[PDB]
Q: What sequence folds into this?
């Protein structure tokens, strides 16, 4: 279930993510003991899911008996709605109310879902009173999620809330050198600089702009440089 | 489900398609470990579908367990809309969210299909965060697909993007020669030159010209030469 | 569904239709495995529809388990538009995308019909990719059909195109002789020769001129000869 | 729907209309199995409509399940254009394309109605390939109808064409006697002979002459002879 | 709608209007069953319009269910041209093709209106084929109306034509008597005989003379005598 590229070690710290990283490690090192719940929000492609998976690995790599479960809220909704239609709701509860860490991603996808919101509420309360770790990610802070009840907003606000903001030029370059290290790549700093300057959006667009430049250098079998990089990225 | 005619074998490589060929061979050699997702775009009849079936053919033969699925985005839409009407959404999701390689063709037909775009978003995230191969083809790069949410455009720009451009005279001649050898046809080079020189459009029109010339030869029982070829293609 | 008077047995082969007839029979004997698609074009009354029924009969008679559908693009347009109004698009698609042989007459009636063009595109792609025979006819070649997208034009050009031209004096007579033979009639050669010489337009006008000669004869109850003929066809 | 005065029995056969009569009777006796289509043309007031209603009477009397529709091409035009404005085109098609016999009068009023012509085209084709009788009347041969496409002219010439030419004096007398007999009148021969001699135009003008002679007789309470006829028709 | 003073009860029969009167009553007693159409022609101020209104009143009085419409051809022309501009021709056809009796006055004003002619043709055929009464008035017989097509003039001649000729002295006297009885005046036969002798033209001028003579008498305050009449009309 846990993408194995998404560790603390592959996660680059910058000003924009420092809080969320420190909170995520606090929680990993001391599950249910440090911050419960941890609520992480922020814009598209900024590492929410990466951090959530990093908390996961850390906890498992340190307690092989720990029942650790990641899933988007869309998947939590689908399994729940199913258990009602198939009358096996008792089996959905024995699953999700007895995990040791619950990592639930993108809770904004519960908007306009009266029933799944309620079931998430009862799941949240059970896990909290049983000293289990809850980690929720969102694209926006609890106040800005519509159709949400006070009682549920109130529990999202009860632990630590951290935001993630987009990285600067320097941080984008550090994210580029980190993926390049991961595949043994010798790349000039003028290239990274050039790439990071064009792509100031999400680390996916960024990750992708690098994959291209390299793959192209490989096809034409020529050394990587800002002349090549710019050619590979016109389109 | 896969065309036996569309393999890496029957695919002639030229300057217009070298990138997409290499990318597709890499993806095929290393499912999910090389480029994920791979996104291929280009004009009419230049080998996108062929390259996608080529990836399928190779993976199934280097891993007879792998679940490999090819479909147009229009079939993905129809099957999805159906699954909601006949209240079997769980069966649609069991299939598309649990494949090892998804080959999804002509992604632009999700233009202005808000529900299906969202269903494809979650399908994508499930497969990518579980190291499954996504290959996506389009008639255009992600920045140019209308209605396309920016949430997906980004996921399309996150792996490798390759385009294919129309093959030159030399590659068209080589596509003709390759089709002829496969039907066991002995055809003079001057005829392949004649055909390749008149048809500079798409490879579908190029195959059609050869089929016409062969059929008109067979009908008038005369050996294939450049006078016959010009006679058979006048209209 | 199919005209029992429209078979290979009743189709007269001349230089003007040798190519279309040869193609139609190859398709009929080896469906999906000789030429696919087959595109037949030609002016008014030259046996396009006759040849498409003849392929229907041949395939049905030789494989009773084959799903063979003949229809005009006009009926395809109305059945589609209707399936949309009645929320029954899925019933349409289950029919036209699962046949073994699609015989679709007069595709020029899709000029100006963008929604149905897209629907025929998707039907074409599904049938071709699943090794099903497509046969399309037209009053003109693909490049002369207005409003057609390049992706659809290219699909019409990808198999064998065959044109039909107006039959010569020898073939007109052969056609008159064949109609007469079927209708138990007995007619001097000078009569066929006179009719054959006067009607050089379409086989409809030709059949019609034989029908008036026979009818004028039956009326004034005198036996058929050149003088009666010229009297009958005085127009 | 049909005129009870317009039968084969009430129709006076001359040499100018012998051929239309025979063909009409043949059609009536064997619908869809004798002449299909039957195309009748001729000048004003020579019994085209009479002959069409006569076909309709004969078929309905020998087959109560037969669906027989008589209408002018101008009524076909107004019902079509309305069915488009009122979005009920499928309701018009259900009517006209499933009749057993279609009797359409004065086809020349389709001249300059390119949309209606096309709908009639598709109506013709549907009715023809399902073995339904078509009967068309015109004031002129298919060739002489302006704006008519080739594909439609060709279909009008595919069956039996029959002209009707104005009646001779013997037939004009034979007809005046039929109308007089139909009203139980006793009228001297010299009266018919006088009228038939002064009126050589259309049977409408004949009928109106007899009506004037007879109305004048009854007004001035004197018997009908040549002198009174001559006095009544002075203008 | 209609003139309450134009009845059978106020129409003075004489030898000049005998035939037209008989025919108009014959039609009124037996709508669509005695003469269809009825064509009335004749010079100025001879009671054509009066007869047409009298038919109307009689039909309405004996049948409250009956749809009777009187109008000038000029009102028909204008309402029809208006219907085309306003795209409401369907509304024009609904009105005029579904009446039980159509009284259309002064048909000659259709001369030169080729478009209105055709509309009146089709209207005529529809009313006629559905056994509705058509009454047409004119200043001249059909052959003398210009621009009229053969097929329309034919239909004007298919029924009864009645001419009206100017009235004699006895009838002029009787008309004056009847107008004078209507107003409740004691006018000596000497006066009526003076007016009738001097006014031999149309009954409008005849009515005009009486109105002057009466008004002259009212002003001078002198009983009406034949010398008072001579001076009143002196100019
Ligand atoms: N700080 C970081 N260091 C290294 N890689 C990073 C960092 N932030 C993001 N990435 C990479 O960027 C990609 C997107 O990260 P992800 O964890 O999916 O972001 P997200 O905020 O969860 N996106 P979304 O759900 O669309 O709003 C992954 O490949 C991450 O490893
Ligand atoms: N490089 C090539 N060598 C051999 N055959 C080729 C090549 N490129 C395309 N073809 C053939 O061309 C035809 C069309 O290829 P296909 O892969 O369907 O193109 P496409 O890019 O998918 N077209 P479209 O989906 O309309 O934009 C097939 O018969 C292929 O076999
Ligand atoms: N070669 C032929 N031998 C015998 N009959 C023929 C031949 N060609 C045409 N006909 C007859 O001609 C008539 C019209 O043929 P059909 O196949 O309908 O023409 P088409 O090309 O489909 N015309 P159109 O659809 O108007 O563009 C039918 O009765 C056919 O049987
Ligand atoms: N041969 C005939 N014998 C008897 N009555 C006839 C004959 N021909 C025409 N009539 C009568 O003439 C009148 C008009 O004939 P009809 O059948 O309407 O002619 P038409 O050819 O349709 N006229 P049109 O549409 O203006 O060209 C009717 O009253 C018919 O019954
Ligand atoms: N025979 C009649 N008896 C009494 N009044 C009559 C007679 N003929 C005409 N009139 C009167 O004369 C006037 C004109 O009659 P009207 O019916 O309009 O004539 P017309 O033929 O319609 N004229 P026009 O339309 O100019 O060609 C009205 O007041 C009628 O009542
Ligand atoms: K709740
Ligand atoms: K949708
Ligand atoms: K050669
Ligand atoms: K094939
Ligand atoms: K359409
Ligand atoms: K299309
Ligand atoms: K047409
Ligand atoms: K005439
Ligand atoms: K007219
Ligand atoms: Mg995420
Ligand atoms: Mg493709
Ligand atoms: Mg045809
Ligand atoms: Mg008629
Ligand atoms: Mg008047």
A:
């Amino acid at each position: 279930m846990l993408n194995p590229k998404y560790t603390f070690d592959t996660f680059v710290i910058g000003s924009g993510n420092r809080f969320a990283h420190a909170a995520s490690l606090a929680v990993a090192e001391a599950p249910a003991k440090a911050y419960n719940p941890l609520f992480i929000y922020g814009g598209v492609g900024l590492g929410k899911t990466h951090l959530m998976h990093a908390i996961g690995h850390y906890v498992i790599d340190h307690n092989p008996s720990a029942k650790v479960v990641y899933l988007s809220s869309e998947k939590f909704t689908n399994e729940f709605i199913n258990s009602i239609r198939d009358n096996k709701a008792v089996d959905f509860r024995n699953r999700y109310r007895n995990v040791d860490v619950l990592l639930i991603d993108d809770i904004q996808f519960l908007a306009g879902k009266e029933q799944t919101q309620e079931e998430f509420f009862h799941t949240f309360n059970t896990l909290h009173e049983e000293s289990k770790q809850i980690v929720i990610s969102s694209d926006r802070p609890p106040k800005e999620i519509p159709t949400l009840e006070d009682r549920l907003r109130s529990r999202f606000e009860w632990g630590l809330i951290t935001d993630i903001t987009p990285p600067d030029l320097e941080t984008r370059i550090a994210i580029l050198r980190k993926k390049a290290k991961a595949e043994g790549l010798d790349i000039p700093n003028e290239v990274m600089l050039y790439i990071a300057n064009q792509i100031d959006s999400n680390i996916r667009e960024l990750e992708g702009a690098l994959i291209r430049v390299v793959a192209y250098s490989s096809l034409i079998n020529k050394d990587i440089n800002a002349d090549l990089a710019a050619e590979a990225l016109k389109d």
